[PDB]
Design a protein around this ligand. Structure first.
Ligand SMILES: C[C@H](CN[C@@H](C(=O)Nc1ccc(-c2cnn(C)c2)cn1)c1ccccc1)c1ccc(C#N)cc1
Ligand SMILES: [Cl-]
Length: 327
């Protein structure tokens, strides 16, 4: 059992080709072949939570729920003949049939890494090649907008890979924001990304007048903010004298936090307005192991897998791949 022998997808074939084209051109002798596999793809729904449901769904103004496809994908490098899993990502894709405001949008739920890619000097670059390649791929299918919440894990916590190396440091926010800006400046110079904005500038330019026009994703910041804001508003009373107030709060919260939310325009102008439907050429992949991040954090803990050194992470990659061909 090895990474290569995991079934192929167009998405995974495209990403590993862009990465290995990049490495071959670097011609660094420390580097090894990279494999990229989608290991989970399934159809999910995000439910408008009770606050927004009472205000927008009940009045016919907004959809009760938004269908998306979730996918997990992993990248692997040959080190000393052996496969090492060094990068992981979970994405939410909302297609052409999805109602507004979610239509034709991709959202990255979680990404993660184990810092052992060889060599060090190309690590950042290869991570960028994977994310830019992902944005290239969904742009070609007809997705118009990408969405990133720039949010590092808390101290000691693990988004995808169980027990990271003690010396793999969590980036602080400003560094992580600068890292996404570098990846996006490159995607702009390659004419994949048209441009990008902080959520607050995006909303101001789209002239967002209402909370129902804001894209609504599973586990994202903004739906929780809207539930807390609607609850604050409904506590208020006023004696005699002698909605828009939700928009005013959403704007204030978008200004306080603008630096952490990226809106990435993949397709701009009239080109975006007469697109054909989105057909994902890749099939569903059921795989309870990679259905969200939790099951893989649980198996790792239970089988004492760790990604805390090259040897343990090489060991855990092998055990990961066994369990993936099994179920
Ligand atoms: C693509 C790659 C993912 N690296 C994850 C990362 O860096 N995890 C990490 C690193 C360390 C620990 C940890 C937990 N306990 N201990 C002792 C260490 C846990 N997780 C991560 C970082 C941030 C957001 C999401 C994911 C990357 C690497 C560098 C930057 C920058 N600047 C951005 C992305
Ligand atoms: Cl993330």
């Amino acid at each position: 059992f090895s990474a290569k022998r995991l079934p192929s997808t167009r998405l995974g074939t495209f990403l590993e080709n862009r990465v290995n084209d990049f490495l071959r051109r670097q011609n660094h002798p420390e580097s090894g072949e990279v494999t990229v596999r989608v290991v989970h793809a399934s159809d999910k729904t995000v439910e408008v939570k009770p606050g927004m449901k009472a205000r927008f769904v009940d009045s016919g103004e907004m959809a009760e729920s938004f269908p998306y496809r979730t996918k997990a994908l992993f990248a692997f490098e040959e080190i000393d003949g052996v496969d090492l899993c060094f990068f992981g990502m979970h994405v939410q894709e909302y297609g052409s049939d999805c109602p507004p405001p979610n239509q034709r949008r991709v959202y990255i739920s979680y990404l993660d890494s184990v810092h052992f890619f060889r060599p060090k000097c190309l690590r950042t670059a290869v991570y960028h090649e994977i994310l830019i390649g992902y944005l290239e791929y969904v742009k070609k299918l007809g997705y118009t907008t990408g969405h990133i919440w720039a949010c590092p894990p808390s101290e000691g916590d693990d988004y995808i890979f169980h027990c990271h190396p003690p010396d793999q440091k969590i980036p602080k926010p400003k560094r992580l924001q600068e890292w996404y800006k570098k990846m996006l400046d490159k995607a702009v110079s390659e004419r994949i990304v048209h441009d990008y904005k902080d959520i607050f500038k995006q909303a101001t330019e789209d002239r967002l007048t209402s909370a129902k026009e804001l894209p609504y994703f599973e586990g994202d910041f903004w739906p929780n903010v809207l539930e807390e804001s609607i609850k604050e508003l409904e506590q208020k009373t006023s004696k005699n004298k002698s909605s828009n107030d939700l928009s005013q709060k959403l704007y204030a919260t978008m200004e306080k936090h603008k630096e952490v939310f990226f809106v990435i325009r993949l397709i701009a102008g009239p080109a975006a307005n007469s697109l054909p439907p989105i057909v994902d050429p890749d099939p569903l992949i059921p795989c309870d192991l990679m259905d969200g991040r939790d099951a893989f954090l649980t198996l790792a803990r239970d089988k004492h897998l760790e990604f805390s050194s090259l040897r343990r992470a090489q060991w855990s990659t092998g055990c990961m791949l066994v369990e993936l061909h099994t179920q």
